[PDB]
Amino acid sequence: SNFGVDFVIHYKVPAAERDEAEAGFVQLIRALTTVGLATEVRHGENESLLVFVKVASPDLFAKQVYRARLGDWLHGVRVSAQALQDEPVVEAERLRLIYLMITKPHNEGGAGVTPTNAKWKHVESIFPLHSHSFNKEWIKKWSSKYTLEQTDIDNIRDKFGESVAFYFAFLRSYFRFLVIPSAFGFGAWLLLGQFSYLYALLCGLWSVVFFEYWKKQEVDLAVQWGVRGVSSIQQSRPEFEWEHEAEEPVKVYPPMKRVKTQLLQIPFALACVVALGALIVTCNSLEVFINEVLPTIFLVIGTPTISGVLMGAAEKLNAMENYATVDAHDAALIQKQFVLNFMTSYMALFFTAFVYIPFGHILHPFLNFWRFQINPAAISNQMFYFTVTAQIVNFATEVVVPYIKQQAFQKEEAEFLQRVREECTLEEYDVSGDYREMVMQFGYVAMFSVAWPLAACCFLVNNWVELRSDALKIAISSRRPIPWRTDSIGPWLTALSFLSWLGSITSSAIVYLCSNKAWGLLLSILFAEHFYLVVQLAVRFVLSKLSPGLQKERKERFQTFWQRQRGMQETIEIGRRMIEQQLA
Amino acid sequence: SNFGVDFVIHYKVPAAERDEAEAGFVQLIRALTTVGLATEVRHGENESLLVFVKVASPDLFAKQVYRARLGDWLHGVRVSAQALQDEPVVEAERLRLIYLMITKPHNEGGAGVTPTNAKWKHVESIFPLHSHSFNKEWIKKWSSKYTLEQTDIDNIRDKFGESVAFYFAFLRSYFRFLVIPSAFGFGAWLLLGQFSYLYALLCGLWSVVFFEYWKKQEVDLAVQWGVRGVSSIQQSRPEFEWEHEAEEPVKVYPPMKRVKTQLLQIPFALACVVALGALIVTCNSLEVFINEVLPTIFLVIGTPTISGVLMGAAEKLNAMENYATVDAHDAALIQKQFVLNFMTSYMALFFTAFVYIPFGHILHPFLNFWRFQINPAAISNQMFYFTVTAQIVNFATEVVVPYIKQQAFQKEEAEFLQRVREECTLEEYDVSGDYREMVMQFGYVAMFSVAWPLAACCFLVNNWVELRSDALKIAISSRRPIPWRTDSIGPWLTALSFLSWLGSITSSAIVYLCSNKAWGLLLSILFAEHFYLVVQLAVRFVLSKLSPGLQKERKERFQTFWQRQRGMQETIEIGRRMIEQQLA
Numbered sequence A, B: 001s002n003f004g005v006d007f008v009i010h011y012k013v014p015a016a017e018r019d020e021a022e023a024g025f026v027q028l029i030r031a032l033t034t035v036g037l038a039t040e041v042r043h044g045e046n047e048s049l050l051v052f053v054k055v056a057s058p059d060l061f062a063k064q065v066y067r068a069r070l071g072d073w074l075h076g077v078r079v080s081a082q083a084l085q086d087e088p089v090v091e092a093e094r095l096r097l098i099y100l101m102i103t104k105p106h107n108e109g110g111a112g113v114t115p116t117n118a119k120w121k122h123v124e125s126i127f128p129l130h131s132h133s134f135n136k137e138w139i140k141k142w143s144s145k146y147t148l149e150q151t152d153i154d155n156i157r158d159k160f161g162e163s164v165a166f167y168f169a170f171l172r173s174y175f176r177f178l179v180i181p182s183a184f185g186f187g188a189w190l191l192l193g194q195f196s197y198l199y200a201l202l203c204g205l206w207s208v209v210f211f212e213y214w215k216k217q218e219v220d221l222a223v224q225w226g227v228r229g230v231s232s233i234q235q236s237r238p239e240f241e242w243e244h245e246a247e248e249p250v251k252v253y254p255p256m257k258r259v260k261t262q263l264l265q266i267p268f269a270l271a272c273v274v275a276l277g278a279l280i281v282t283c284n285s286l287e288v289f290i291n292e293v294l295p296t297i298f299l300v301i302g303t304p305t306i307s308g309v310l311m312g313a314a315e316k317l318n319a320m321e322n323y324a325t326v327d328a329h330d331a332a333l334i335q336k337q338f339v340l341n342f343m344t345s346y347m348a349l350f351f352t353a354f355v356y357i358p359f360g361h362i363l364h365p366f367l368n369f370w371r372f373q374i375n376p377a378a379i380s381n382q383m384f385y386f387t388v389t390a391q392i393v394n395f396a397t398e399v400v401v402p403y404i405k406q407q408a409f410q411k412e413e414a415e416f417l418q419r420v421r422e423e424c425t426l427e428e429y430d431v432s433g434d435y436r437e438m439v440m441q442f443g444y445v446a447m448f449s450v451a452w453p454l455a456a457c458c459f460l461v462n463n464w465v466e467l468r469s470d471a472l473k474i475a476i477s478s479r480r481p482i483p484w485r486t487d488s489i490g491p492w493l494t495a496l497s498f499l500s501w502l503g504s505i506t507s508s509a510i511v512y513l514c515s516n517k518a519w520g521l522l523l524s525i526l527f528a529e530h531f532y533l534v535v536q537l538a539v540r541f542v543l544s545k546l547s548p549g550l551q552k553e554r555k556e557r558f559q560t561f562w563q564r565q566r567g568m569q570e571t572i573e574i575g576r577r578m579i580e581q582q583l584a
């Protein structure tokens, strides 16, 4: 088990700047002195020098806890020095506070030793330590239950922080709500036939209901954990660069440079879409030529490399575009990720459904250069070849291939030191990737399940694996993430709403086109869109009348002409006089 | 001027229950004793008995003011016994507090003498008194200025309360924003011709911009006056009836009876729409028969009576349907008013545009019974005959006819008594009617100005009269309204949004139909609707980055393994040893 270590710093020391780096080390050992953290130094392979830090004096930690509590109470996060026993401390919050003490600048109670901007550029990783016993128990418990109750998600929140807990709760809710589309698709595939308008309407209604119920559940969860409104607190980015400083004093960046850098996005998107469209058109032309006298499978198996290259390019562009706050930078990065992944994972199906189907006479030059009728039922089978194959490769590159890579690389207190040395080489866990994968799966169900009604069922099975598989990816395949606080899942709500709307637009058009005049198609699209809007309004209105959080908040709030009538017998007597005399 | 009188109670005493009513009078003179209000009794014509009440002891009034301030601070209305000088008192708030003291029940600090449910059913009117000097000065000032600055609206808020001030601010903003549609319509009428798509798009954009800017301005105004969030405070309705009482104890009404009464609305709406449709169809058939070998003018001049009858029926139905809170009852009444007025004022134009234009062969039996081609340009001129005529009759029945009626009815301290006796016979001022009229005018501009582009200009002129004329209607033609507090204009925002959306749908369809295939019309409608949605999103996003209220709120918030290394020189020395020995 752990030796009480709370944080580990790598601090690689290359021989090139042996003096300078050494000086930095001295500064580092001073920067951790004033805060009150005990530091020990140990050998680290690959010419590194692992330092272990942990809080020693309980008084300083209690003062920091009280300061953080007051800070969050001031901003409205909390509605309610022996308070530590009154509200029990948890591992996630304690680790977050220690990390803040390590990272926060001087003028805010901390000693900022962030590894990016200051002189100590040798530091590159600050991570907590894993718990093997808890990981083994967690895996064993989750692999032997049919479902996960709220207690397991609460334990995840207690240990690994709030972001991981929110992701797991969202995945569980999505998996439990995916049952209805699966049953509906099985019913439509067994008797209804193919390309049914009823299935499209039911899918739209299910998407609306799931989205609204998830919003309500996330509000309730945020209220329950006492992290309601943390999104309103801004956290400054250490890497933010400033040119002019104005007045509390806050650094200001000229917005013109930001807009100038932002406009570089449009050529990037145009080049990406042109190249990918050329690739998919060439692949489809080759497939059609082969049919006339596998390429889709080759494209599906070869797209991850191009996706990774574009992802690296997008992250570099986001880094170049200066951002002052963490939330804005994360939102911009998420938007770029979603756009690229949407294009890459949807353009093939869009071309198959809305180009090859309605008029297949436009790719004639491609066939002629390679050297005929269009199949309305092609897309259906193609959709299958897009689902199952993916469900295989996504299960390969995310589970077994990393294990094989780790096995290949791998092949008195030395046990703990060896364990931490092996742990320090892993990559930091990112929660955005799982969110993106789940959102893309939801989009598949939303706007392409009508072609192949059984598809949802397959996804359901995959979800039951993912809820465990991702857990394994955190157990052994990644280092412990830094516990942060998040009110909600973030900008993914906008992505889900956009995908639902696009699905409502697309499913009816696909049904009308594959079942067979422009007026009929336009009428079908209009009716589907307006039905979606009406269902959205009705579901919002119904769910507005259902939440214990507001009850608790209300309970807390509740718990927390003059002188002629001077007397009054005289007034009554004169009133009686008027009452008597009005009878005349 | 006034004799210091703060409130007047009529308390008509018919000779039928001379004893019983008299007993009630005694009870009344006791109910106003405990609170601390001086009561005087004076003769009232039509066998009535006017009582004047005013607060005498400053200590009780100060205590009530402090209690109200604490109550609103507890609910979040206020973010910030000599406090009266610290925050100056105003006539509107003082009158509201006195009215609450008169009306609030026993267990809440008041002495509830509401004139509806209790034994004192003889009471029928409690009203404040007008100020002739202030009214004359206000009329003279407003009739000699080209525009009204924020100071005049602030004075209105100080004197007549918050509801009237909000209505006047909304009317001023609407009048100032109506300039752009007028210029656009003049430009389109001078050179562009008739039935232009560009004008429809510009009208949609203007409606979106005006709605969003009004929302922002109303948020700012609510923050400035310190009445932000008063909508969240529920006020119990004295007329509410209960059957079973549960547990603080609150009365509960069986929702099944409420739904049973609510379902009576559908037959009412069906009967109203059928009767009105038959009427308009008959009028149009008569007009067409006369053309083949004025009726619209007769319909326009005769609709107010039917409108009033239906309005009385709707108010009776709303009274029958029991409601527990004031806001819900007001919202339901407003919804019924809007539905009825929308139908009555729009069905004629809808029938002319979407029935007579696309296929005029369906009313053939009507013409045959009375005993041919349709005119595409008819609706335009018809729209004119619907605007100007209305602008006349609405200016007649609302300004001059009430003055004539009052003149016909009319023809040591007796002057003040005579003035109050004449004042007590007027009807209570209602602010919903002006809101409904303005909303209907906005709907006219939104979805029927493309047929007659000049129409907006005419409306502009009318607005400049209304901003004064309505003021006159409060000066002499109505009694002083009870000053209440409102956060926003209320449910009229939903009506404005619905009217804007319907206008975006309707204007493009009218353009396409009157300019001449179903596919073209459907494409035009779809493009117009989606352009409206995109413009709405863009305007919301832009206006989200513009407000001194949040700055003030932020300013207020801001203002408010272990033992082997014990020392630290030893740690640095051992670190040096590692640095030296890693070179080998």
Ligand SMILES: [Ca+2]
Binding pocket: A394, A395, A398, A466
């Ligand atoms: Ca997976």
Ligand SMILES: [Ca+2]
Binding pocket: A433, A434, A437, A466, A470
């Ligand atoms: Ca995953």
Ligand SMILES: [Ca+2]
Binding pocket: B394, B395, B398, B466
């Ligand atoms: Ca008028």
Ligand SMILES: [Ca+2]
Binding pocket: B433, B434, B437, B466, B470
């Ligand atoms: Ca008016």
